[PDB]
Design a protein around this ligand. Structure first.
Ligand SMILES: C[C@](O)(c1ccc(-c2ccc(S(=O)(=O)c3ccc(N)nc3)cc2)cc1)C(F)(F)F
Ligand SMILES: O=P(O)(O)OC[C@@H](O)[C@@H](O)[C@H](O)[C@@H](O)CO
Length: 585
């Protein structure tokens, strides 16, 4: 019937109590699963939230149990890292006409960008031509914007890839998609396999290939799953690689910007840095070199969450200022500035939040005086401003701006990275009472810009900011158990996530859930056979423009009522969240 094929890959809602034994659960990709640790994240206070997310992050480093999924420290994965470092070396010997592309959508694209800069700095420092570039769904602008809609085209991915691979002779394309999901990446990987002379694809994500996305892509014939099964067959001959350790579900379900983006850096910085540092030594990359780097990243998690209490306190002050209706400013220097802007932007699509609600700044790129002149005026009693820097930064630029803001704010906390035995200028630097000092043991780096120290700090800041931004919103009651129910449908994945969430919270059939969602999306237009059979992109395009799509659809299901009736009830309620939670009860 109309729509059957569009919706075929969707599994039926299991009966009450049979969610386990249906094996609906067994087919939910790890990246989409509910994390058991965060069952009650919506009831944790600020310190528990910090404890719970630090613990979810720790799962990146958990080793394989004895019939189960390969993980970061499993031998098959590390061996694949080794072989990939190998192939990157080949290109580093023959830079002429060589290129290395790091590509993803959303946060995968963001992570790509940072890494491409770093390894370009590193080749610069050695006086070598930069060989890295990045690709991101929707073009360069996407690096620092909420543009969730742009990942759904495989021709787009391929076009970007063809632009940059210009007239190169040897191209490594590292397609990153946490969910093994983005059609932007799938097209690149497939195109690489049709020209193996030139291209070597390397696919990075965090699901087993058996769980890779398998619904049709609108502008492409193969599914991500097919593309990844075929890359895996090519790996036996070293013409493709799939690098896909499980890292366990996200603490906020399906929020792959968190563990996923972190694991992307951990995994790729490790491997790229091993490759570089072993070419000039005339020595193959080896498990042992990678391990050293992985264990350093693992210490970085411990070190970072040593500051949990003060992490929780920044949480409380970010949530407060949002709860009144203030804004939160994230002020950082060099690469940590960039990461700040990335965090704030991601809050737009992740929590429905305004661009002003949690925004980042680099010294979006506003110089010292420029920030003092334009932004400084807009501050208020109830706002919160966060300073993020190292002791290597230019602390006269720092303290100035802090001085200025201190008058207008009072809620300022800060995030400071030091090697042990560095001190804070002004012992009266008690402009910040009780800082989040994060102090890094001395380590034996040998490259000029000390790249291992940069990656540690970036990763640690990422974790802090991710945990704060995410925690501040959970405190406001915007998250249900460990799901963001009220998201904005802006791509096909988000559309499947919504339908999934409707089945889980209603317990009602697939067909009912699908019908409610399409009615909520296209109201006031009734369901027609065309709408039922339309490409998912049609539903996305319409839903992306509306508010409360998913809650309305869930209310209509729970009260077994019309869309007209569910909107009226929502408008009659004190808030979306209360309407939903009391309807659930
Ligand atoms: C955990 C939960 O059941 C759930 C179950 C499934 C999904 C989900 C399942 C599949 C998709 S998807 O976009 O089709 C997809 C995405 C990635 C992938 N590798 N495979 C499929 C998106 C979301 C999301 C959530 C619920 F409780 F949240 F509903
Ligand atoms: O890396 P994937 O699975 O291809 O996901 C790509 C993007 O959808 C994803 O990073 C999204 O922007 C984030 O908001 C999810 O937290």
């Amino acid at each position: 019937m109309p729509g059957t094929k569009r919706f075929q890959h969707v599994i039926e809602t299991p009966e009450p109590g049979k969610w386990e034994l249906s094996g609906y659960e067994a087919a939910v990709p790890i990246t989409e699963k509910s994390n058991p640790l965060t069952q009650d994240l919506d009831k944790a206070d600020a310190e528990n939230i910090v404890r719970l997310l630090g613990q979810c992050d720790a799962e990146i480093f958990q080793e394989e149990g004895q019939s189960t999924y390969q993980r970061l420290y499993s031998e098959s994965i590390l061996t694949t890292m080794v072989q990939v470092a190998g192939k990157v070396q080949e290109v580093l010997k023959e830079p002429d006409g060589g290129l290395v592309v790091l590509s993803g959508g959303g946060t995968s694209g963001r992570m790509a960008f940072l890494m491409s800069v770093s390894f370009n700095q590193l080749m610069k420092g050695l006086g070598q031509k930069p060989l890295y570039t990045y690709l991101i769904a929707g073009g360069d602008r996407s690096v620092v914007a909420s543009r969730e809609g742009t990942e759904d085209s495989a021709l787009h991915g391929i076009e970007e890839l063809k632009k940059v691979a210009a007239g190169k002779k040897r191209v490594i394309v590292i397609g990153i998609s946490v969910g093994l999901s983005a059609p932007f990446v799938a097209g690149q990987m497939d195109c690489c396999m049709n020209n193996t002379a030139v291209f070597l694809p390397v696919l990075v994500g965090f699901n087993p290939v058996s769980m890779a996305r398998n619904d049709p892509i609108e502008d492409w014939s193969s599914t991500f799953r097919q593309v990844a099964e075929r890359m895996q067959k090519m790996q036996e001959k070293q013409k493709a690689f799939v690098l896909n350790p499980a890292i366990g579900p996200e603490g906020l379900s399906g929020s792959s910007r968190m563990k996923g983006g972190s694991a992307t850096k951990i995994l790729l910085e490790t491997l790229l840095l091993a490759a570089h540092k072993t070419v000039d030594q005339g020595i193959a990359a080896s498990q042992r070199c990678l391990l050293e780097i992985l264990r350093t990243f693992e210490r970085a998690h411990q070190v970072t969450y040593s500051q949990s209490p003060k992490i929780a306190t920044l949480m409380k002050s970010v949530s407060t200022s949002l709860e009144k209706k203030g804004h939160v400013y994230l002020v950082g220097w060099q690469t940590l500035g960039i990461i700040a802007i990335m965090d704030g932007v991601e809050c737009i699509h992740t929590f429905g939040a305004d661009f002003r609600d949690v925004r980042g700044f680099l010294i979006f790129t506003f110089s010292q005086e420029d920030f003092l002149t334009s932004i400084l005026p807009s501050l208020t009693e109830i706002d919160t401003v966060v300073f993020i820097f190292t002791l290597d930064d230019n602390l006269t630029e720092v303290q100035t701006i802090v001085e200025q803001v201190k008058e207008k704010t009072n809620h300022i906390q800060a995030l400071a990275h030091s090697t042990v035995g560095q001190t804070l200028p002004i012992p009266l630097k008690k402009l910040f009472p009780s800082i989040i000092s994060i102090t890094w043991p001395l380590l034996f780096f040998e490259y000029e810009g000390n790249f291992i120290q940069k990656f540690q700090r970036e990763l640690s800041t990422k974790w802090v900011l991710n945990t704060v931004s995410t925690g501040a919103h959970v405190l406001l009651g915007k998250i249900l158990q460990n799901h963001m129910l009220d998201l904005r449908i802006s791509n096909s994945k988000l559309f499947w996530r919504a339908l999934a969430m409707l089945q889980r919270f209603s317990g009602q059939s697939k067909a009912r859930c699908i019908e409610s969602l399409l009615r909520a999306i296209h109201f006031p237009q009734p369901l027609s056979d065309d709408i039922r059979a339309a490409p998912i992109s049609c539903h996305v395009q319409v839903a992306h423009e509306k508010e409360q799509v998913i809650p309305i659809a869930l209310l209509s299901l729970l009260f077994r009522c019309s869309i007209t009736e569910a909107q009226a009830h929502l408008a009659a309620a004190p808030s979306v969240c209360e309407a939903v939670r009391s309807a659930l009860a």
